[PDB]
Swiss-Prot record:
Interacts with AP1G1 and AP2A1 components of the adapter protein complexes AP-1 and AP-2. Interacts with the GAE domain proteins GGA1, GGA2 and GGA3. Expressed primarily in brain (at protein level). Belongs to the NECAP family. It comes from Mus musculus (Mouse). The gene is Necap1. This is Adaptin ear-binding coat-associated protein 1. The WXXF motifs mediate binding of accessory proteins to the ear-domain of AP-1, GGAs and AP-2 through hydrophobic interactions. Selective binding to the GAE domains of AP-1 or to the alpha-ear domain of AP-2 is tuned by the acidic context surrounding the motif and the properties of the second residue of the motif itself. The WXXF motif 1, which is preceded by an acidic residue and has a glycine in second position mediates specific interaction with AP-1. The WXXF motif 2, which is followed by the C-terminal carboxyl group negative charge, allows specific interaction with AP-2. Involved in endocytosis. It is found in: Cytoplasmic vesicle, Clathrin-coated vesicle membrane; Cell membrane.
Length: 133
């Protein structure tokens, strides 16, 4: 049906997810959403991540069909740049890096925390081992 050979790949996906777009800038470490705010840059579509073997790459588009299509390749090493609302608001942000110099910052959230949780916790389940393999 699908299980035949195991490999190093998270296999994270999500047909229903929302993400924000903000200039790749940062003069510090601690974010400030409560003061940053954002209601314009926030496209909706499908987001997922995977890894061939020695490296990884995140693919995004639309679970339905989309159009443009894009992705963000990762070196599968400089894993970092992930945080949430320092002052507590109602969303979260995630970023990635590759080669130790190229990293993109974007926000991820949903009209509800319950759903946005299952999605986030899903990508992790595949990454680090805790609840399953």
């Amino acid at each position: 049906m699908a299980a035949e050979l195991e490999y190093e790949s998270v296999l994270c996906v999500k047909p229903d997810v929302s993400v924000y777009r903000i200039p790749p800038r940062a003069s510090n470490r601690g974010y400030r959403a409560s003061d940053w705010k954002l209601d314009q840059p926030d496209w909706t579509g499908r987001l997922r991540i995977t890894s061939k073997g020695k490296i990884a790459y995140i693919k995004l588009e639309d679970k339905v069909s989309g159009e443009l299509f894009a992705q963000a390749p990762v070196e599968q090493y400089p894993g970092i740049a992930v945080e949430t609302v320092t002052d507590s608001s109602r969303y979260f942000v995630i970023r990635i890096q590759d080669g130790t110099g190229r990293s993109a910052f974007i926000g991820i959230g949903f009209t509800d925390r319950g759903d946005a949780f299952d999605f986030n916790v899903s990508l992790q389940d595949h990454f680090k081992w805790v609840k399953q393999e």
